[PDB]
Design a binder for this molecule. Structure first.
Ligand SMILES: O=C(Nc1cccc(-c2nc(NC(P(=O)(O)O)P(=O)(O)O)c3ccsc3n2)c1)c1ccc(F)cc1
Lengths: 254, 277
């Protein structure tokens, strides 16, 4: 009656706490820098942007809560992972609810293909997470070619959501999927290299070593620069973009 | 020959659905189907749209049990080990979540905009059900009978309303079944609770399988702060006696609300059959 509507509204506050626990962790205020850069082509409406951002950022973190459980991570960016605090069921709930609150949010774009797209990209992400666990469960390191596959499914899976949602809400229609893989790998491999120089996570240098001390760092350096090159050569054939290339050349520090 | 991505891909689908399949093969998925067919005697929906509404409902159900078992730390389900104790927590979470989104994809094929609206609400609801369940658990508290019923209509007992609601989108039938659907949702659940018990020299949180069950709750509220040989204790409290009473009492209101919607032979057959327990 009365008491049930209080006890219910409460549960929704509670439900977001693991999601919030992940928001507050250090860095990943730099995601925002990136989508803003992409808007120098898409010229998207400020109000559709804020929702595409809200969504992307919801799906991301909900997807990390699961990824940590699934990877049996112990820490994330140095702090304990969400499940070791709130506990697995409490987390599963929060991520899943947040994913669906993000559906609800995409519905507000009022665009039938946006749900179509969200659904595809999530389905993709789950297959990535799929493989990741498959390998883990079978005590197996994936090959370099397979590692990249998983990243484009998981990472290009959720770059591609955002850039693709925005491109729905733009008269810009030239092909960024090419550029987005080049960035997806770039970002990942970099964050792998940085992180080393794992937490139950397959990482580009460890994989290259394992498929012969080794100087995978030497190879990873080489492999990273080589993408950045293809970043610029595909950035240009899309009429160029100052904001983005600033954020690339900045990041090529590591 | 980069048939390597074609293999690596076909594989992932097989893998991803294995825990979902593991749950299908446990007994009698033919009884959900029996029910929605009965409801079509009012909605007169197209056979092909029905099949999808059914596929969806049935996907959401099982995916929702895979999670329920993890979350309730169940050990067994319908006698066999639970899905996660075989395939393992991460592998299961993945499969349920993927299945939920394959059900989105499926609802999209109904090609009617309100269907996504509805699915999204029902899922969000389901999660709040799971919400409550753990709220109570975390607070070391047994919920009231009143509250238990609320949780059931929110959660997996809820999932009739998705289907009947999807169907009613595709129908010029517009009279109110939500009333009848609670009466049925509780009926179905409480029955499956009673059955599950009447099925050792076991303890209760063994038999319930770490689950809130109508008879155990009624017992616990009879002999501001916080609430051997089970079966005979429950009969010594006679929750079984009360559950019998409480079940029949709904079935009665099933019939009295079935009728004020112009009556329905198919359904009433399936009720009176099921009233066996
Ligand atoms: O891993 C994904 N994206 C991606 C790509 C490049 C870097 C990162 C990333 N990676 C992180 N560290 C590592 P992890 O995800 O194991 O914490 P990763 O490099 O192996 O993904 C962290 C940690 C705190 S914020 C963060 N962001 C994530 C990812 C996760 C969930 C999705 F739904 C989609 C992509």
């Amino acid at each position: 009656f009365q008491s049930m509507e209080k006890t219910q509204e409460t549960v929704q506050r509670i439900l977001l706490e693991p999601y919030k626990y992940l928001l507050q962790l250090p860095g990943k205020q730099v995601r925002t820098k990136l989508s803003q850069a992409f808007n120098h082509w898409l010229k998207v409406p400020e109000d559709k942007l804020q929702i595409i951002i809200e969504v992307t950022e919801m799906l991301h973190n909900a997807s990390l809560l699961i990824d940590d459980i699934e990877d049996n991570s112990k820490l994330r960016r140095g702090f304990p992972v969400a499940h070791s605090i709130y506990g697995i069921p409490s987390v599963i709930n929060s991520a899943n609810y947040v994913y669906f609150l993000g559906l609800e949010k995409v519905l507000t774009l009022d665009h039938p293909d946006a749900v179509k797209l969200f659904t595809r990209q999530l389905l993709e992400l789950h297959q990535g997470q799929g493989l990741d666990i498959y390998w883990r469960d079978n005590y197996t390191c994936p090959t370099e070619e397979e590692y990249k596959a998983m990243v484009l499914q998981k990472t290009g899976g959720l770059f591609g959501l955002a850039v693709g949602l925005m491109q729905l809400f733009s008269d810009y229609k030239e092909d960024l999927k090419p550029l987005l893989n080049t960035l997806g790998l770039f970002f990942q491999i970099r964050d792998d290299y940085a992180n080393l120089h794992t937490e139950g996570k397959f990482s580009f240098p460890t994989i290259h070593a394992i498929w012969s001390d080794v100087g995978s760092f030497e190879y990873t350096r080489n492999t990273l620069k080589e993408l950045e090159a293809k970043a610029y050569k595909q950035i240009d054939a899309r009429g160029g973009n100052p904001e983005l290339v600033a954020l690339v050349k900045h990041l090529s520090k590591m």
